[PDB]
Amino acid sequence: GKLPVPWPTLVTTLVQCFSRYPDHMKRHDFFKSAMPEGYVQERTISFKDDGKYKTRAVVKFEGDTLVNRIELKGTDFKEDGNILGHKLEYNFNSHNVYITADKQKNGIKANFTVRHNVEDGSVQLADHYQQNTPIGDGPVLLPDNHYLSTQTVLSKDPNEKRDHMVLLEFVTAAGISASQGEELFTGVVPILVELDGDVNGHKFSVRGEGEGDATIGKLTLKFISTT
Amino acid sequence: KLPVPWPTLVTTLVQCFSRYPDHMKRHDFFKSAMPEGYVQERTISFKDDGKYKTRAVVKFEGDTLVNRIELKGTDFKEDGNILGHKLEYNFNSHNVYITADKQKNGIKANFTVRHNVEDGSVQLADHYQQNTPIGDGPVLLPDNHYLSTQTVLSKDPNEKRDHMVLLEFVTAAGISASQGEELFTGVVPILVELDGDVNGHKFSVRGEGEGDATIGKLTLKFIST
């Protein structure tokens, strides 16, 4: 069935290990350094004048596939707002994801604001607060301050009768071998994404499949409602 | 070296590949002009800088949709964002507002492109566009509407030449119907050839790839000479 929220509001929740880190920045790539054991990615996303999402994800390898499992809890949303009212355009803006090391917890943090285009020509802001912690014990890379520059395009499959999102995404690190986990990304890697969602009591699920190429920073995924 | 940044050539380098939803198919001028095609002319005014004047012939040659362009740039500042190569390698989303031009049996469009500058400023590129059919056949003159664009620019790691990889999705909004549209029901190969002169710097670009108007998708790689 159709998702109770717009697809664009789920983009950031639905694998930053596929960001392209330039050769001079491989020392700062926490995400790959946590592989294959993986990392926990937790976020609070606050929609301006509306509700909020709380997400916890496990991102790790399962065989040769990079898997992103997520639980999402949405609360306090307006019945007539841009989210539950489905007033967001089917597109996605480019953002800068600002990353800082979290030495106390052997991980990283991120703060950034996503801008969702509204059908009336305005914008719906979504403030993101992000924390990443390794799952394994092996050494990871704690980075200097930098950011990820994102580009995304959303499309549809014309023959797909289920609610779905086709996504192509390019992310490059900026603002400024180093791990064995970095070596797990020298080629095209299959991706699986599974999200369990609850927004204002409306339960839903999403499954995504595709591939990532961290040498160019390219993600190609198709997500489908499995509710 | 390409004398201008790749992003400034994106709009010049095939709106017949836009996805017109079923309820808007009687407003698709671009496909209705096919296979004989149309001439697309623009003036692109880079605010506080120079201008491009472009004239393109867009038509089928056999199974291939060809876009052949002559571009002339004048009045550019030697230290501006264009000649100074100060523009980021990316591209924003735009709404292309289309109106019928009944007297010319074609359309006009107006929109302002926003080019991000490396220092955080913005270089605006005001587009004035007119399209006229080449053939004598009937075309669709649309009600006012717009095309909503999304584009990602990337690089081919295997490509040694100066180049641009482009992926673009365009959908019509803001509101078969001819036979030209029937030529776009599948994947269509595309050839793009541009001959340019900007402040006396001559250059050429060749692009190849394919378009899928059912989803509004363009996949192209451009190489500079």
Write the CB contacts of A63 (distance below 8 Å, at least 6 apart in sequence).
none
- Please tell me the distance from the alpha carbon of residue B31 to that of residue B29, in angstroms, as a whole number: 6
Mutation choice for A interface testing from B10, B122, B147, B154 by most A CBs within 10 A? B154
Method of elucidation:
X-ray
- Please tell me the distance from the alpha carbon of residue B162 to that of residue A106, in angstroms, as a whole number: 41
Q: Is residue B1 part of a domain?
A: no
- Please tell me the distance from the alpha carbon of residue B140 to that of residue B27, in angstroms, as a whole number: 6
Give resolution in angstroms. Answer: 1.4
- Please tell me the distance from the alpha carbon of residue B58 to that of residue B96, in angstroms, as a whole number: 18
DSSP A93-134: ---EEEEEEEGGGTEEEEEEEEEEEBTTS-EEEEEEEEEEEE
CA-CA-CA-CA torsion sign (B4, B5, B6, B11)? negative
Helix (H, G, I), strand (E, B) or coil at A151: strand
Q: Is residue A139 part of a domain?
A: yes
Q: Inter-chain contact A156–B215, Cβ cutoff 8 Å?
A: yes
- Which residue is closest to B185 within chain A, CA to CA? A158
Q: B173 — contact with chain A (CB < 8 Å)?
A: no
Q: A170 — contact with chain B (CB < 8 Å)?
A: yes
Neighbouring CB atoms inside 10 A of B130's CB total 16
- Please tell me the distance from the alpha carbon of residue B151 to that of residue B191, in angstroms, as a whole number: 18
Give the total number of structural domains in chain B.
1
Neighbouring CB atoms inside 10 A of A103's CB total 9
Q: Is residue B195 part of a domain?
A: yes
* Type of residue numbered A160: E
CA dihedral B74, B77, B79, B80 (to 10 degrees): -90
Let me know: does A127 contact A53? Beta carbons within 8 Å: no
For B97, B110, B117, B125, the CA distances from B43, given in Å and listed in that order, are 15, 10, 21, 10
- Please tell me the distance from the alpha carbon of residue A205 to that of residue A118, in angstroms, as a whole number: 24
- Please tell me the distance from the alpha carbon of residue A153 to that of residue A94, in angstroms, as a whole number: 10
Let me know: does B34 contact B188? Beta carbons within 8 Å: no
DSSP A10-68: GTTT--GGGSB--GGGGGG-HHHHTTTT-EEEEEEEEETTS-EEEEEEEEEEETTEEEE
Write the CB contacts of A145 (distance below 8 Å, at least 6 apart in sequence).
A98, A99, A100, A101, A175, A176
Neighbouring CB atoms inside 10 A of A79's CB total 8
Let me know: does B98 contact B1? Beta carbons within 8 Å: no
Query: Locate tokens 């979290």: which residue?
Result: A102
Neighbouring CB atoms inside 10 A of B200's CB total 9
- Please tell me the distance from the alpha carbon of residue B107 to that of residue A116, in angstroms, as a whole number: 31
Q: Give the domain CATH number at B165.
A: 2.40.155.10
The DSSP H or E segment spanning A211 is strand A202-213
Q: Biggest alpha carbon distance in chain A?
A: 51
For A139, A219, B95, the CA distances from B124, given in Å and listed in that order, are 47, 30, 14
Burial of B157 (0-12, 13-18, 19+ CB in 10 A): exposed
What are the chain B neighbours of A158 within 8 Å (beta carbons)?
Answer: 214-215
Let me know: does A196 contact A71? Beta carbons within 8 Å: yes
- Which residue is closest to B213 within chain A, CA to CA? A158
Query: Locate tokens 């790839």: which residue?
Result: B209
- Which residue is closest to A158 within chain B, CA to CA? B215
Domain range enclosing B121: 6-224
What are the chain A neighbours of B168 within 8 Å (beta carbons)?
Answer: 153
Q: Is residue A81 part of a domain?
A: yes
- Please tell me the distance from the alpha carbon of residue B14 to that of residue B194, in angstroms, as a whole number: 13
